[PDB]
Design a protein around this nucleic acid. Structure first.
Ligand SMILES: [Mg+2]
Ligand SMILES: [Mg+2]
Ligand SMILES: [Mg+2]
Ligand SMILES: [Zn+2]
Ligand SMILES: [Zn+2]
Lengths: 115, 91, 141, 162, 55, 41, 83, 53, 407, 47, 111, 61
RNA sequence: UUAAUAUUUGUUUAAUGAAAAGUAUUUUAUUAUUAUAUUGUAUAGUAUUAUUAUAGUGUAUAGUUUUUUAAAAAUAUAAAAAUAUUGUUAACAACAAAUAAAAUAAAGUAUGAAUUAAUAUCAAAAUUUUAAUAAAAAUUAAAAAA
């Protein structure tokens, strides 16, 4: 349950996962490494391919978060939520960026592996 | 809603829902006369997309400008030159 | 304290809605309608609103000491096919009297017959405007 | 089905302990000296104090996300006005640093490294030794093979704890 | 016009059923045959096994 | 009928009613096979 | 693949890339204009076990540009002097 | 990758990758035994020497 | 007005016109600094009112003054470390005496008697572990001491190890010293002291398995594997680790150790059954991972190698009993359903200890991100509704999404 | 909590002024972002 | 869904680790004594309207938890699965009963 | 100076916004073009679960 | 004690420069242009991170990004038929009856005050009486728990 208000949580999805063009072979047992990275894929469906228009849209939206202004927004959000009294929010000095060069390189390697 | 081109005055109609309330004032739409992207301004008001609760589909309805704009481009004196080629009611 | 408003007895709490497939309710309704048809209290009808509303209706109501004979256009219908809950809305205007009748189907004393065989939507609109003007006028001022 | 719960009277009425007059417990010289809680029955194999520095993440996890705490990076009152400590903290300072008092050093100084001296009171009484070092400002002597205690040296990166 | 309540007036709430059902009660659980974790019937896990065949 | 266990009242395995003369003239009933120990605990 | 870049747009429009980027952020971050700041984003000294925190290190892009501030908002005296 | 591994299994006669590699390295060790036949931190540290005299 | 005390620490209603107080957000109460103020004391550095003077002299004394050592002294500190051989001899003697003086448990009739606690044994065994580089499980030690035959085995092996170390020295220390010297500038067989050590560690692991601590049993077997350099001892240790990992539901490690014990077949003595046990463990790990055809192939190869050892035969009979029913239900085990069902109670206990509960320890209470705890909103791996990442906007760079109403 | 909600366990009443003060505070936060002021919590001590 | 239950779970984990380090059997542990008594408290200002103010009490307490070994303890069965889960696993293809394999005992004969 | 600076800043912001909108519209048109190409190549038609006979009848639009 | 309380609950941003005020450790805050010493640039106030756009210039499409919750009563707003009442006007105001549909404000998980507090693990009810309500007495009677 959601800890804040103890509300019951529900996972809602579509049924025919395999008959779909997108989301063919996607694994939702655990989320991706980042929210802008492509979702997990089972080992059996590693060679799957996605529609090119949706792929380009996702690539644009993900490259949106690869800039330094996003890192500044991230640290500023840390500062805002720390000033607003929210606990378990580290100091913007202790925070670290979600997207770095080596991490992006290995994620690109994994994306080319998943083709 | 009814919008006009800022450059040439070309007018087209399209209802605005609750998901496009931010684009009711100014629309960046492709103009067929200017053959490029032009800014469109709000000219007249249509009824709505959905339905007012316990009110018919006519409520509220478009303004007198929208009703006049339609009647000049499609009506008795407007479709008469076009009723001789196809008579749109038929194919 | 001294009374109780609710009952938790099994007989009353239990419902039988799950077992309604063993009962053909719609078939029983159609059987009642067909019984009325064969007895002559109503005649079978099938139409849509766009083709029923606006048709003149001749209604003879058996009342003492003399039946009342009216002619009034259809303003609305409540059921497309024939049914025990068919319903019919009729606006009848006499020499100085304007009335809005809702005649139910299957009454042996209220014999109403549709005669136009057609819709006449423009006549419906005219009668609607007439009734609206008369209704707004009739209020005392 | 239902667990047995009972309201405790200590949560309804628990006053403070009787304080000590002149800081004197009237039975110090009468009762034996045993560690606190042993004879009463209070015992514990492990004590986890959630106020330590290493338990901060556990405390903040056990706390709820709804309850917020403000002034996390700043403070309403200016923290650069000099002001005195608490009474117990000033007493700790006075009890620890006693050589800060004026004219604390003994005069004349007679104890120099190389003198043979006997311990006349305290632990190791009647034992002889040679003065090794002299901490003159603290009025302290380091005698040879007298009051030998283990000096714990913490473990560094490349050196273990000795 | 309220006055202080004695310890016996405070414990009367425990005698009721509204207090016991809210505080003093346990859970009926079993081990998830897929996750090997304690689990109550009716609620399931975020897992492609526990979503298709939800035990 | 995932939750409906045949022969058991409301899916409770400790309320077996099969091979007993429970008269249901227009409802099916299953035979009785002795339940295992792990199915009841 | 040719997505919008602030530097490219500023090079196309000849609009001082620094000033162009400052056009899309609060004025108090780039100019000496009255604006409130969060106490968390301000630097804090070093502690035993952690290095020092510097506002200039943790927000390099959110620094006021004195050159742009003087050339846009502050008035020059060379145009005012009349001897 | 699914049909790729399926074709791998079909080519290696149902023997999985681990089984195949195990058999190959076991044959390697047996050949090594044949060649042999035909041919024939956690612990404590000691104290270091003194750094100076 | 003033329906209680006058100090700010009082608990009743006050007023400004009669009792004006300065703004004190949160300060410690009359008894002591609570955790709500110690949180500030550790994060902000002072109590959240700013009126309290930070007095950290005690923690300074506890950390910095203690860890301060002059360089001229630390240069010679390392030159007076105790002799490792003498330390090992003394630790072994003390541990052996403490194990020998352990009382024999009396067997009662009608109820299970409580075993005497190992109070004087945790310190000698700690010194033994820190001198030998191998950790021993206290539950396993207690079980070995409770078991009369295992206690005799442990005593005999420990006495043999003591005698060998006192007469010849420490062979692991010699090996490490020779390796370090060779690196600064081959491999002998398993010595008698190393043999006694791995034997007593195997006894400890067997006692730990009899107790029911498979993780500690496998750990003891793992740190005992580092002392055997003989093929027979290595094959036996690999079979033991495979069995322990099977019990602990470590299927990967069980399969690895089983195939290692199988690969150690050509250079092992023909009398040993460690290779057969390794094949058994490999096939069992396959069957637990639900690879029934793989397990059948492995057990068939194991039978052909060893013509029908009893363990291999029983495992093959069990696999055949499963194969006589798997096609009767599903013709195979589905690929997306393999290694999905729990079979052992070890993983049940592990899930009970480290599962996701209702309200806490789930993906809705706190999330971990690089050794730091975050709220459910600030989750970098999730952009579900309610996360802060849905309010980022275009950042004044370019229109990333075609969404008109949000973002 | 079904039995509790049935037997009315808890305050049958609720706060009434909040559904309007919430949107008032949201508008005030909009105004604060306009005036380039940091956003503060509506109820820091009244909680 | 209780904060106190979460705190007691943390305390139980710590006490179980301590008992296992002491040498006790995990499957035979039993909560022999659980009790709480008041601890340190903190104050927080509660500014009220009309120039009034009070001081809230941030309360905290201490928790004693004893785990003892009981060899005569018999735990109830918690592996019984509902009929719905049983037949769902059957429909999927999984065995209703967990697969158990005999594991030979640890032997030190090869050394 | 204030007047001129404010007007220049607002004008430059307007021009940058116009460029951004133009580029995004161009990219979305290219996206729709690629989507149409892929749909025609894969046989996908977003005209419902039915076939082309319904559209040929064009009784529903 | 009230208190299993009231209250809080952070899921979607339409706007642009000072000075008084505030001093919060700006580690070199900025990196440069011009010229020419010196001096100083981030955060109001209402006991608060509070119904809050301090209106000194100036103009404007940057969406210039912290408000939980699965039914109810009473209350608070908004709407509220082809019934009826009084006026304006060529739809507007309240009303009385169907005052009815429909909108917003839940336990429960958390945090947590204040008025108040002589008191028995307080005593349903009726009758008679006694120095002003008498819960004070007496007689009949028989009054469950949450
Ligand atoms: Mg200040
Ligand atoms: Mg202020
Ligand atoms: Mg005030
Ligand atoms: Zn145009
Ligand atoms: Zn599960």
């Amino acid at each position: 349950r959601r800890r804040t208000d103890a509300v019951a949580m529900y996972f809602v999805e579509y049924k025919n996962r395999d008959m779909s063009d997108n989301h063919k072979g996607e694994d939702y047992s655990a989320g991706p490494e980042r929210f802008f990275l492509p979702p997990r894929i089972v080992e059996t469906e590693k060679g799957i391919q996605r529609p090119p228009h949706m792929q380009m849209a996702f690539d644009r939206w993900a490259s949106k978060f690869k800039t330094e202004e996003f890192h500044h927004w991230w640290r500023l959000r840390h500062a805002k939520l720390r000033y607003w009294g929210v606990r378990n929010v580290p100091h913007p000095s202790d925070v670290d960026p979600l997207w770095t060069e080596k991490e992006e390189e290995e994620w690109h390697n994994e994306m080319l592996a998943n083709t | 809603a009814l919008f006009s081109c800022f450059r040439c005055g070309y007018m087209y109609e399209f209802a605005v829902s609750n998901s496009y309330c931010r684009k009711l004032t100014l629309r960046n739409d492709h103009c067929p006369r200017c053959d490029q992207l032009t800014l469109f301004r709000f000219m007249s008001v249509s009824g709505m997309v959905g339905n007012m609760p316990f009110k018919p589909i006519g409520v509220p309805g478009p303004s007198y400008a929208t009703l006049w704009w339609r009647k000049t481009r499609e009506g008795k004196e407007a479709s008469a030159p076009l009723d001789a080629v196809c008579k749109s009611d038929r194919w | 304290g001294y009374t109780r408003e609710r009952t938790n007895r099994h007989f009353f709490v239990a419902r039988a809605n799950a077992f309604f497939s063993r009962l053909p309710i719609a078939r029983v309704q159609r059987s009642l309608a067909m019984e009325a048809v064969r007895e002559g209290r109503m005649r079978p009808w099938k139409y849509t609103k766009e083709q029923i509303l606006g048709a003149p209706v001749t209604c003879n109501f058996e009342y003492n000491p003399r039946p009342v004979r009216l002619i009034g256009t259809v303003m609305d219908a409540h059921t497309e096919e024939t049914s025990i809950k068919g319903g019919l809305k009729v606006y009848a205007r006499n020499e100085e009297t304007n009335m809005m009748l809702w005649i139910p189907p299957g009454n042996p004393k209220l014999r109403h017959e549709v005669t136009s065989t057609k819709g006449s939507f423009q006549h419906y609109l005219d009668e609607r405007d007439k009734w609206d003007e008369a209704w707004i006028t009739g209020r005392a001022r | 089905m239902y667990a047995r719960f009972r309201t405790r009277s200590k949560f309804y009425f628990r006053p403070a302990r009787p304080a000590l007059a002149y800081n004197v417990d009237p039975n110090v010289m009468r009762r034996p000296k045993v560690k606190r809680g042993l004879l009463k029955g209070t015992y514990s194999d492990e004590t986890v104090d959630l106020r330590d520095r290493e338990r901060l993440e556990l405390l903040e996890s056990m706390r709820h996300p709804r309850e917020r705490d403000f002034y996390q990076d700043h403070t309403y009152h200016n923290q650069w006005l000099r002001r005195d400590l608490e009474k117990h903290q000033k007493q700790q300072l006075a009890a620890r640093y006693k050589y800060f008092a004026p004219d604390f050093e003994i005069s004349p100084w007679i104890w120099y490294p190389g003198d043979i001296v006997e311990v006349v009171s305290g632990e190791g009484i009647g034992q002889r030794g040679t003065i090794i070092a002299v901490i003159k400002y603290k009025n302290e002597i380091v005698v040879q093979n007298i009051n030998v205690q283990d000096v714990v040296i913490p473990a560094s990166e490349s050196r273990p704890e000795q | 016009p309220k006055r202080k309540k004695n310890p016996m007036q405070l414990r009367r709430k425990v005698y009721g059923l509204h207090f016991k059902e809210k505080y003093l009660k346990m859970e009926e659980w079993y081990y998830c045959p897929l996750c090997a974790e304690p689990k109550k019937p009716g609620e399931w896990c975020r897992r492609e096994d526990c979503r298709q065949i939800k035990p | 009928a995932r939750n409906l266990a045949p022969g058991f009242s409301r899916g409770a395995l400790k309320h077996d009613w099969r091979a007993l003369g429970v008269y249901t003239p227009d409802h099916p009933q299953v035979p009785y096979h002795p339940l295992q120990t792990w199915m009841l605990g | 693949r040719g997505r919008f870049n602030m530097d490219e747009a500023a090079a196309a429009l000849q609009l001082n890339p620094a000033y162009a980027a400052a056009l899309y952020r609060p004025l108090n971050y780039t100019f000496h204009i009255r604006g409130q700041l969060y106490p968390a984003q301000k630097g804090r000294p070093s502690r035993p076990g952690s290095l020092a925190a510097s506002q200039g290190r943790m927000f390099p892009l959110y620094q006021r540009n004195d050159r742009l501030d003087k050339e846009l908002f502050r008035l020059n005296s060379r145009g005012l002097t009349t001897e | 990758r699914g049909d790729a591994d399926r074709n791998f299994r079909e080519a290696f006669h149902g023997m999985s990758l681990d089984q195949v590699l195990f058999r190959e390295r076991l044959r390697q060790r047996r050949m090594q035994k044949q060649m042999e036949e035909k041919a024939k931190t956690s612990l404590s540290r000691d104290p270091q020497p003194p750094p100076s005299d | 007005y003033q329906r209680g005390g006058w100090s700010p620490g009082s608990k009743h209603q006050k007023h400004m016109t009669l009792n004006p107080t300065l703004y004190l957000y949160r300060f410690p109460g009359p008894h002591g600094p609570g955790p709500y103020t110690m949180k500030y004391w550790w994060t902000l550095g002072c109590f959240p009112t700013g009126m309290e003077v930070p007095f950290r002299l005690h923690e300074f004394l506890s950390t910095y003054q203690q860890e301060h050592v002059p360089v001229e002294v630390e240069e010679w500190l390392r030159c007076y470390i105790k002799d490792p051989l003498s330390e090992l001899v003394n630790a072994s003697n003390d541990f052996f005496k403490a194990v020998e003086v352990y009382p024999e448990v009396e067997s009662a009739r009608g109820y299970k008697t409580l075993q005497p606690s190992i109070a004087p044994l945790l310190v000698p065994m700690k010194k033994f572990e820190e001198q030998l580089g191998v950790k021993i499980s206290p539950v396993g030690l207690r079980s070995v001491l409770s078991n009369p035959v295992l206690k005799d085995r442990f005593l005999d092996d420990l006495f043999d190890y003591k005698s060998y170390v006192e007469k010849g020295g420490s062979t692991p220390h010699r090996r490490l010293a020779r390796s370090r010297f060779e690196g600064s500038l081959p491999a002998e067989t398993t010595a008698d002291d190393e043999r006694s050590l791995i034997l007593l560690l195997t006894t400890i692991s067997e006692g730990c398995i009899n107790a029911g601590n498979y993780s500690d049993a496998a750990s003891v077997l793992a740190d005992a594997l580092m002392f055997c350099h003989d093929p027979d001892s290595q094959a036996t240790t690999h079979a033991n680790i495979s069995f322990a990992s099977l019990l602990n539901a470590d299927f990967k490690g069980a399969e690895y150790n089983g195939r290692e014990a199988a690969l150690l077949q050509p250079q092992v003595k023909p009398t040993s059954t460690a290779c057969a046990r390794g094949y058994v463990g490999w096939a069992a790990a396959a069957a637990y991972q639900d690879d029934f055809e793989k397990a059948e192939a492995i057990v068939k190869d194991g039978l052909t190698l060893y013509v029908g050892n009893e363990h291999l035969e029983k495992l093959a009979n069990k696999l055949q009993a499963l194969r006589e029913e798997q096609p009767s239900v599903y013709k195979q085990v589905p690929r997306s359903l393999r290694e999905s069902r729990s079979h052992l109670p070890s993983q049940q206990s592990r899930g009970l200890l480290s599962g996701s509960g209702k309200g806490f320890s789930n993906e809705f209470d706190w999330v971990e991100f690089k050794n730091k705890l975050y709220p459910s909103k600030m989750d970098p791996r999730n952009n579900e509704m309610g996360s802060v990442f849905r309010r980022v906007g275009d950042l004044g760079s370019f229109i990333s999404t075609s969404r008109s109403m949000e973002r | 909590s079904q039995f509790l909600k049935r037997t009315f366990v808890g305050g049958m009443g609720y706060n009434v002024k909040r559904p309007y003060r919430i949107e008032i505070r949201m508008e005030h936060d909009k105004k604060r972002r306009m005036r380039r002021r940091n956003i503060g919590c509506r109820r820091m001590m009244k909680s | 869904l209780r904060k106190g239950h979460q705190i007691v779970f943390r305390a139980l984990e710590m006490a179980q680790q301590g008992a296992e380090a002491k040498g006790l059997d995990k499957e035979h542990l039993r909560v022999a004594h659980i009790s709480c008594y008041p601890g340190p408290t903190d104050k927080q200002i509660d500014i009220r309207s009309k120039g009034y103010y009070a001081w809230k009490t941030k309360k905290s307490s201490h928790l004693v938890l004893t785990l003892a070994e009981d060899p005569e303890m018999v735990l109830p069965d918690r592996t019984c699965l509902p009929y719905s889960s049983l037949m769902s696993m059957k429909r999927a293809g999984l065995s209703a009963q967990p697969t158990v394999i005999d594991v030979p005992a640890i032997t030190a004969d090869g050394i | 100076k204030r007047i001129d600076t404010a007007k220049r800043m607002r004008r430059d912001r307007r021009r940058i916004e116009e460029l951004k909108t133009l580029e995004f519209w161009g990219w979305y048109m290219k996206l729709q073009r690629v989507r149409g190409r892929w749909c025609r190549e894969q046989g996908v038609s977003s005209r419902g679960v039915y076939g082309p006979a319904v559209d040929a009848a064009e009784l529903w639009g």
